[PDB]
Amino acid sequence: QLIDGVWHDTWYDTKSTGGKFQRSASAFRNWLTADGAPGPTGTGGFIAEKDRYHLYVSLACPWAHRTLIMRKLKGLEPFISVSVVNPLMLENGWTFDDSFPGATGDTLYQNEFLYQLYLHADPHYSGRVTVPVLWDKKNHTIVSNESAEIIRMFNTAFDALGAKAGDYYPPALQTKIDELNGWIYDTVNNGVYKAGFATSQEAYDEAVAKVFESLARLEQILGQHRYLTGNQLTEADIRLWTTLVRFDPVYVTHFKCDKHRISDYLNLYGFLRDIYQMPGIAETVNFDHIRNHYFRSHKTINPTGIISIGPWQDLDEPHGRDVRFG
Amino acid sequence: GQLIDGVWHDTWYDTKSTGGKFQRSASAFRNWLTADGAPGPTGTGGFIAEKDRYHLYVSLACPWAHRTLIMRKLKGLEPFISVSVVNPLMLENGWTFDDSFPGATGDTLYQNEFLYQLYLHADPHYSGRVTVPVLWDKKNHTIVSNESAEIIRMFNTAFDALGAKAGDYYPPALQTKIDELNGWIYDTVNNGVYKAGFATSQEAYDEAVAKVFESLARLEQILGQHRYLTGNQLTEADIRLWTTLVRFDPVYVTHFKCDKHRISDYLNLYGFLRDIYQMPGIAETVNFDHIRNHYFRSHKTINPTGIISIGPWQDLDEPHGRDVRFG
Ligand SMILES: N[C@@H](CCC(=O)N[C@@H](CS)C(=O)NCC(=O)O)C(=O)O
Ligand SMILES: N[C@@H](CCC(=O)N[C@@H](CS)C(=O)NCC(=O)O)C(=O)O
Numbered sequence: 001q002l003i004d005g006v007w008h009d010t011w012y013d014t015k016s017t018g019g020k021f022q023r024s025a026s027a028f029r030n031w032l033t034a035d036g037a038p039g040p041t042g043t044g045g046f047i048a049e050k051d052r053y054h055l056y057v058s059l060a061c062p063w064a065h066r067t068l069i070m071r072k073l074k075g076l077e078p079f080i081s082v083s084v085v086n087p088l089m090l091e092n093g094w095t096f097d098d099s100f101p102g103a104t105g106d107t108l109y110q111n112e113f114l115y116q117l118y119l120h121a122d123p124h125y126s127g128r129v130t131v132p133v134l135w136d137k138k139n140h141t142i143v144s145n146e147s148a149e150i151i152r153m154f155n156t157a158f159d160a161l162g163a164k165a166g167d168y169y170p171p172a173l174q175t176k177i178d179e180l181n182g183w184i185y186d187t188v189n190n191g192v193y194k195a196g197f198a199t200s201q202e203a204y205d206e207a208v209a210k211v212f213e214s215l216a217r218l219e220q221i222l223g224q225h226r227y228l229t230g231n232q233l234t235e236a237d238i239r240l241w242t243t244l245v246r247f248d249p250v251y252v253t254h255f256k257c258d259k260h261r262i263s264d265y266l267n268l269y270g271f272l273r274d275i276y277q278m279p280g281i282a283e284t285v286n287f288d289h290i291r292n293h294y295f296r297s298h299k300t301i302n303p304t305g306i307i308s309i310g311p312w313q314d315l316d317e318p319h320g321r322d323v324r325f326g
Numbered sequence: 327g328q329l330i331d332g333v334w335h336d337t338w339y340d341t342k343s344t345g346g347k348f349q350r351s352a353s354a355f356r357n358w359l360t361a362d363g364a365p366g367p368t369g370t371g372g373f374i375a376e377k378d379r380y381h382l383y384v385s386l387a388c389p390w391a392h393r394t395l396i397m398r399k400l401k402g403l404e405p406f407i408s409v410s411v412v413n414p415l416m417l418e419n420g421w422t423f424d425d426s427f428p429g430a431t432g433d434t435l436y437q438n439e440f441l442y443q444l445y446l447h448a449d450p451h452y453s454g455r456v457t458v459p460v461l462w463d464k465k466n467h468t469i470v471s472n473e474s475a476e477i478i479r480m481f482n483t484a485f486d487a488l489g490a491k492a493g494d495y496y497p498p499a500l501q502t503k504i505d506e507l508n509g510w511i512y513d514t515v516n517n518g519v520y521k522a523g524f525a526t527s528q529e530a531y532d533e534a535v536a537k538v539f540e541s542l543a544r545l546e547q548i549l550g551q552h553r554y555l556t557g558n559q560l561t562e563a564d565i566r567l568w569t570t571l572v573r574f575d576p577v578y579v580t581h582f583k584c585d586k587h588r589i590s591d592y593l594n595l596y597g598f599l600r601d602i603y604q605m606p607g608i609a610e611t612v613n614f615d616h617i618r619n620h621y622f623r624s625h626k627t628i629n630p631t632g633i634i635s636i637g638p639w640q641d642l643d644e645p646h647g648r649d650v651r652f653g
Contacts, residue, residue: 116381194551198633203634204635207638209636212636226528239446252580252585253579253580253583253585256580256635256636257636258579258580258635258636258637258638259636259638259639260639300630300631301630301631303627303628303630304525304627304628306525306528306531306583308535308585309535309581309583309584311586311587313585
């Protein structure tokens with residue numbers, strides 16, 4: 001964590017006294033727009049254009065992963081450059097230590113720590129230092145560090161400039177999507193963390209049951225049609241998939257969500273391989289980063305730092321859900 | 327923890343050592359219970375098979391201790407061997423006689439507080455690990471054996487003339503095959519899962535866990551040829567493999583990170599697991615609460631939180647067919 005301009009090695013902190021962290025922690029909720037107008041929150045004028053915006057991600061984070069997937073589906077590679085922090089999130093938090101294969105270092109300003117860029121945008125900044133970060137190269141500031149919104153910007157803001165066709169938040173499906181997003185976040189995306197980081201046996205039992213209850217639900221839905229809302233791929237699927245692709249390799253063992261493996265569900269496993277095999281998506285998946293990060297960064301639950309050999313799986317097996325449905 | 331010169335050490339066992347290759351009690355307890363009281367190949371004589379003399383201190387969580395409980399059922403030795411179950415929580419005092427946990431009985435002979443008190447009684451200045459199972463001699467108030475591989479040999483024959491059920495799980499004809507299996511099954515599986523769970527470095531874990539799955543693969547091949555490891559006869563090699571197998575999905579998979587495959591993913595190993603589990607008398611010896619509680623809560627070095635994972639789903643009651651499939 002990063003308190004009023006200074007870092008604190010998990011020293012967050014001595015306690016509280018006014019009052020939640022803080023008045024600038026989600027002060028990065030601006031929107032990229034096509035006209036430069038401010039979005040529904042934050043301020044303008046971050047207008048969609050080339051060679052201006054940049055992504056700071058870890059390949060290990062399921063939230064940052066969303067933005068990489070949307071970057072591929074929408075053909076935004078020629079508009080949006082990418083920096084990849086080191087997988088080992090140690091005492092300094094996200095680090096620009098390259099050397100780990102696929103780690104790039106701060107390829108813009110050559111900083112040494114992710115928290116440095118947060119300061120370069122607000123030196124009096126109080127709050128968490130998270131990926132993903134959508135960065136304005138021209139104002140040297142943070143547009144947004146909220147992945148749920150970054151993927152919506154990517155969805156339309158670049159269309160006139162030549163983005164690939166696709167709308168992952170179509171006005172018709174929006175209420176279904178917001179609804180799915182609601183419980184999928186609480187019971188699955190964030191669910192596996194509530195379980196893996198649970199404080200007591202009682203906490204863990206409640207969290208992990210929610211996880212598997214929802215999996216049974218999703219298995220059912222997938223079920224009646226190819227994706228969550230029907231025959232159309234939406235951001236609700238992408239948001240579910242980033243957790244799913246990490247489930248068998250990390251969450252099952254590391255976060256003790258071990259009642260069933262994704263590979264045990266007919267549909268969920270098919271869904272997993274489906275999106276996995278979409279052109280361009282496999283390359284955004286890097287299991288070394290994923291596994292090194294979780295097993296080595298979380299000393300409070302895996303003190304030994306040992307990376308388990310991992311549940312067996314083959315994501316390249318043809319899935320036939322394109323045929324099966326509708 | 328560990329006893330040093332009669333003194334228990336809360337897991338500072340010891341402050342290194344400076345002396346060094348424990349000990350004069352590394353001689354452990356290796357006497358043999360025999361039919362006529364003659365001495366076995368180690369230890370001394372006088373431990374003749376009889377009623378109301380011998381007792382067994384176990385944990386329901388321990389695969390080694392579990393071997394002796396199973397042999398006790400198969401051979402019908404309940405009339406001759408009484409049993410005490412220590413508490414599953416193995417903390418800073420080692421095995422404990424804390425009842426309160428269901429299945430824990432306290433010390434049914436002398437109501438001690440700690441397993442290590444029994445060791446001290448046998449050897450007031452004992453230096454070594456305080457382990458289960460312990461075969462205790464009520465007459466001479468000492469320890470006969472604390473070596474599970476030998477206790478099962480004793481159970482297998484020592485009582486044959488006093489009413490033990492017919493059955494030889496180490497018969498002359500199969501001894502060579504059995505000894506060979508025991509050798510590699512012990513090093514890569516019974517103890518292999520431990521080498522993996524407690525590996526100090528990533529390299530140590532990598533080598534242990536691969537040998538574990540390499541051996542399961544080999545075992546899967548063997549158990550697709552006949553009902554048991556050596557053919558159509560159950561032997562101690564099966565029993566020794568089984569006690570690990572039954573703990574594999576509830577604990578070793580998650581807790582010891584042996585998670586490439588689940589036993590339920592193997593047709594034959596999973597059949598063999600259900601097959602032995604469903605033999606009369608066997609299921610009573612299995613207590614998943616003791617097992618899952620012991621491993622997750624006791625090993626704070628591996629699992630600081632002491633959280634007990636919900637655990638891989640399984641079902642050992644479903645019929646297995648192995649009684650017919652072969653041969
Ligand atoms: N709500 C934000 C937060 C993203 C997030 O939780 N990122 C994690 C990755 S697991 C992170 O960088 N955490 C580091 C920290 O909290 O110190 C989002 O959806 O992107
Ligand atoms: N040599 C013993 C080994 C059994 C053993 O080490 N049991 C473990 C339980 S998993 C134990 O009592 N360990 C206690 C300790 O080391 O402190 C045998 O094979 O009978």
